Amino acid sequence: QNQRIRIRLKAFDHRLIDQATAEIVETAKRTGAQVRGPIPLPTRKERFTVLISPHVNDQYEIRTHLRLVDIVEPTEKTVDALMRLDLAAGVDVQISLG
Amino acid sequence: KPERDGLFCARIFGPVKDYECLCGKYKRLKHRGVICEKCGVEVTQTKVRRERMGHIELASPTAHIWFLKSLPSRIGLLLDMPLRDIERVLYFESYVVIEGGMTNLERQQILTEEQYLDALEEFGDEFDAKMGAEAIQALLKSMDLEQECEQLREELNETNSETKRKKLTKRIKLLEAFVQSGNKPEWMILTVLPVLPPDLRPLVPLDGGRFATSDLNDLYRRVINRNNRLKRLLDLAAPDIIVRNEKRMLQEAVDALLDNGRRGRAITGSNKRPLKSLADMIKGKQGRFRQNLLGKRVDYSGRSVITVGPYLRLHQCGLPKKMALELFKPFIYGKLELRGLATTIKAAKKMVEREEAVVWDILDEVIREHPVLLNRAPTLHRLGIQAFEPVLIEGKAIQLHPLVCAAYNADFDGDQMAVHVPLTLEAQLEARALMMSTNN
Amino acid sequence: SERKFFPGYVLVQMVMNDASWHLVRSVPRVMGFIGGTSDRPAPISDKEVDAIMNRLQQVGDKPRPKTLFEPGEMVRVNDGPFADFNGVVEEVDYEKSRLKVSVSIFGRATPVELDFSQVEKA
Amino acid sequence: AMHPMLNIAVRAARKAGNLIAKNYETPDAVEASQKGSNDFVTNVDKAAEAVIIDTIRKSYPQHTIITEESGELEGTDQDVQWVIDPLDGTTNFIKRLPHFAVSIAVRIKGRTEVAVVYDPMRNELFTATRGQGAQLNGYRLRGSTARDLDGTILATGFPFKAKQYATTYINIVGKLFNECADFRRTGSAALDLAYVAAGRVDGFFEIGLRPWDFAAGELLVREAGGIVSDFTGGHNYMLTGNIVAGNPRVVKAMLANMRDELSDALK
Amino acid sequence: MHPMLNIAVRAARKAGNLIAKNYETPDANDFVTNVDKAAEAVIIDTIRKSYPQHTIITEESGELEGTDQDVQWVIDPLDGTTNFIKRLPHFAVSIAVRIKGRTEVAVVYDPMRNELFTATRGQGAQLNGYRLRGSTARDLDGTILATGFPFKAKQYATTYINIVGKLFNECADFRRTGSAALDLAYVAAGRVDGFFEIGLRPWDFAAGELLVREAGGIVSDFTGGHNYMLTGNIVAGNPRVVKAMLANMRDELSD
Amino acid sequence: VVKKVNRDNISLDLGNNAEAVILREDMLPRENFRPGDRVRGVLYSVRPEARGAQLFVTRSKPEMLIELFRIEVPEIGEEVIEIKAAARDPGSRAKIAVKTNDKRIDPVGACVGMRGARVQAVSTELGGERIDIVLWDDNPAQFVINAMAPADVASIVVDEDKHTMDIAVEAGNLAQAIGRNGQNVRLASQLSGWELNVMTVDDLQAKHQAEAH
DNA sequence: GTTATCCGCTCACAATGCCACACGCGCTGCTCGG
RNA sequence: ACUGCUCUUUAACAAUUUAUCAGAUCUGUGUGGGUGGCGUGUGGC
Ligand SMILES: [Mg+2]
Ligand SMILES: [Mg+2]
Ligand SMILES: [Mg+2]
Ligand SMILES: [Zn+2]
């Protein structure tokens, strides 16, 4: 069917991201989809803040490790096994088809 | 299937199939009360579609054709305004100034185009000349009831002659009756039109898909279409004269729905005849009163042609075997269940269907004293309906004593007569005691 | 698909003379005028004139897909890759026209960019 | 289907109510402070209001918002309002009395269009959208079919913020106790309105209620067969805060009974 | 204190299960009494199997005796019946076991919220494993009154109205869920500061009064006496608020 | 996803008509549900022969947290951080003690994640559940010392025959050490499975030596 | 002149009951459709 | 042709103030459920 299922992955963790991308390409291969490159784009800094009871007159800086996976042969097994196997929290999965 | 949010929508009125969701999800009595989520219908008895009513949020106020054109017009007397001007301002062809601002304009005065625009040039504010239904609504809601009531009261003891006093005592009677009851004059101008339950205006089908559109649905479709179009126009920057004419058209359509009588007609397509409005379902020889309420058709009776039968005694009357076997059927089922000759009701129905040699003895037993009512077609006076005891005969005619047939004003030119069977014990004994021929 | 600003009405730029009055009315299929009292028409005011003119200009410049989707309504999916799914429109878009839609993918809800053609009822 | 803004509102109310329940089982985390008469306001109010505002702005970054705390947050648009009470009956949540609710309604052109109240303790979810009606966890709501002031139950509230009417109020209640059967008092206007629309109590009335404490319930009782009014039969109840609500018969009877006992200040 | 309480808890469990089960036949005045009788009967079965010697005291059956007349079972299978009549879910079962002219076992169980308060004299009153420590109010400032309108004692109507008027002038706010037993349980568990009602009955408050007294509170009549057992006039709560309430409410009574 | 909620159970769907049921004890006492939500759990029981529903999922039994960490903690699932044991109090507070084979592993600095992200994610997924990650030692005394963290005990008196352990906190920390309902203690008594005793760290517990001097 | 008075003007509003039988019941050029 | 010339040895933590001694139930598918509205005309009495 139509091709470009492009997955962005914001993240603040490291090992679970490797695990997630690995099992994602694993599922793509268990389907047969022409999985494109995960292509780890350059890490993006983020000055965070602490919106709780502050200090007296800290999650302030963090490094978002990003992932760009792509599935361009979505037969039944891709979406089936993907919606079946959930992914841990702490990562953002804003996907696109277009 | 009922189109969603339509004149028959199941979500708004009720489920079509008895105790079954529309989408088909829920199908059992185990869910009496819940609403589905695929289509959102409350799975209950279909009978409720006979009861639930709908409402239409009219995109603009509109008059109620009854209180406008029912002499004497309620609004007219309630406002001391000639009906002609009220009609000319309702249908958007005039103006009415309200509250009588700094200008020399009275709160009840009307305006045409040139006067309105000239006063508008002379006064940009403190002068509110509104036109149409909502204008009259504001005019009503601004009027103080008991204030003007007591004003006219104190005034009536002041002036002459008795023609003014007559009209004014009529008006103060109206105002006193009004303020006495809980009514409020602004309710006389509809703002939300209630639409009849769907089942009471059923889209009756034909052999294929040629559903006979009952005219009520036609009128409602016309009105809701005007309303939807008018709302869409109200949203698109509202070209003033356009929306003016559209509100006029909607007012006309609603008037036609409440009563197709006044304001011309609303003829159906290619069938040159007016449509049954709501009032047309109440007034007349076909209105609910003279058609279903006062005299209702009876399910437990029959008719035939009367022969003479000059042998029966004065209280007896002939009765064909067919007619008795059809009428007293429940009594026959009861007697058969008593003697156990048919344990199940369906077995008894089969037995009556075959007319076993025992069913005739049973029938002869069950009417040995059970009276019956005979009636002539034009029942001019009290004797037009009498009570007899039936006697089984052959053929299909209804024998009756010659004397009472002289009493019925009944010849034997083929005049037909209707039969009736009083079934409750009170009615049997009543017919035996009051309307038996040996009493009249 | 073709719509109308307001059906049943037609707009003209006539003048006021009884001859022209009839000439307008003496045409195959029209009802009367729409304005002041019958036999004395009234003009659609110049403010409304320029208003409808701007509306006409806007509709003539940009042919634009209407029948939009409102943020927070459930909807099925007619997409190939995502056939027979259903989710809530998490954020709508018009020029991009690709319907940011949240839907249950691998458990938790996820936002997707399923385009207009891949959007079912509502 | 389901009204869109109604879906957003019910999701937001669900999240707020989950946060409420979370704060409930911890009589330590609540750190309140008194603001009015015989009532506190907690940090939980601020947390829930924040969650609601954020969830709304997620799918509606321009709608106007109204709240007892933040007053009126005027979004870039001003025709679509969201009247919010992250808590009705904060007094009860102080004492952990398990009877309270979150309330969210949407006004369009001044007319309430969708409304929800949510009791997290019984997991009850009163939804109501205009022209389609009110639902309790998937059941329709018709209000008590009672036809007179006999045997009825009357929900009410005592004006702990305007106790001057109390005496008058007392007389009112006294007069009503001549006819009605029993009263009800939960310290939660929204849930009182819901119960009315739920047919659980056959009538409600209160003297001097806050605007964002009924704007959700009033649509419920409207689309559940009931009607609302002030104590004089008018529509100014949105300003006076003086509410009566219930099926038409009981409302008419209550108004007829109270026409005398009432005071001219309220009318 | 263990076996009696376990038996009573199982009885309340069965009662609440049957009540909640029958709560799902929607209907819009008699069948409520029917399921009332049914729950009372299964309670009676629980009484007959376990300890057939004790005697039963119900609003419905009056008093049904056995051999051990020293152990009375005061079981109201429903309090605030009108609520269940109107599907308003605020109602509970109230089990009480009095021994030697004195209450000793008390249980109040709401099946809707699953609230199971137990109470043994001396060792106190627990809830789901938690100890009810009463209310913290020392006066009638900002407090809540579990107030009850006498819909069965209309004779004291105006007196009660004047009393609650003085109170609301002094106190802060009322509550009334239409369930005497649950009102007593709630004022016991510090959920509402003080409680007071007019014209009650032993089968109603039999357990709630103990639930309150075990929570650092007191239960009395409108004159500080101890005849509230039968006069139906009850005021309860931690002693501070009860004193602060009586000191204001005495001077407008009639009994 | 769910279909229906009752007072004793709820009904779940898994697509392709796969229907399951979740009993009351399986659920948290306050977890509000609604037809449509996408609930997760652990498939603890099956009855391929039952007269009715056959699939049984829970969220309360302690294995739920094991599986949740397994899907969260990339360390776990490969057994580089072996989950030793875990005790729970449904939806309220669940302690857990794990071990590790590798020396350079920080179970407090890894299973928690970064400034409290992993365990926080598991909790917020669980619906507001307090969690206590602690290192499992192989000595019941030191282990229960670890268990009541946060606390501090200076008088550990163990008795293995009686399964008893006097583990008493510093005077003053009790209101925090015991915690409401003795949760911090209730879980400890379950985590090691021993009938503990937390009364007094510096008096009236050393009867022999105390009364001796 | 005005104020009340009256007389012709126009419109609303009724037309026995039944029975039986028969016949018919939009459309149409714009709109959705391949 | 003519920016680039080691930065020095893989994560740096959340849970936290009374109170505790951890403290009954896995049965169905017996049973029913699974032409008409209006108009008009025609006659009859
Ligand atoms: Mg004749
Ligand atoms: Mg509030
Ligand atoms: Mg009782
Ligand atoms: Zn459905």
UniProtKB/Swiss-Prot annotation, chain D:
One of its GO terms (molecular function) is inositol monophosphate 3-phosphatase activity. Inhibited by Li(+). Li(+) binds to Asp-85, Asp-88 and Asp-213. Optimum temperature is 80 degrees Celsius, 90% of activity remains after heating at 70 degrees Celsius for 5 minutes. Disruption phenotype: Conditionally lethal, cells are unable to grow at 30 degrees Celsius and less, grow poorly at 37 degrees Celsius, but do grow at 42 degrees Celsius. It is found in: Cytoplasm. Changing G174V: No growth at 30 degrees Celsius, IMPase activity not inhibited by RNA polymerase (RNAP). It catalyses: a myo-inositol phosphate + H2O = myo-inositol + phosphate; 1D-myo-inositol 1-phosphate + H2O = myo-inositol + phosphate; 1D-myo-inositol 3-phosphate + H2O = myo-inositol + phosphate. Keywords: Chaperone, Cytoplasm, Hydrolase, Magnesium, Metal-binding, Ribosome biogenesis, RNA-binding, Transcription, Transcription antitermination, Transcription regulation. E.coli makes very low amounts of myo-inositol-containing phospholipids, so the catalytic necessity for this enzyme is low. Part of the processive rRNA transcription and antitermination complex (rrnTAC). The complex forms an RNA-chaperone ring around the RNA exit tunnel of RNA polymerase (RNAP). It supports rapid transcription and antitermination of rRNA operons, cotranscriptional rRNA folding, and annealing of distal rRNA regions to allow correct ribosome biogenesis. This subunit may play a central role in organizing the structure. This is Nus factor SuhB. It comes from Escherichia coli (strain K12).
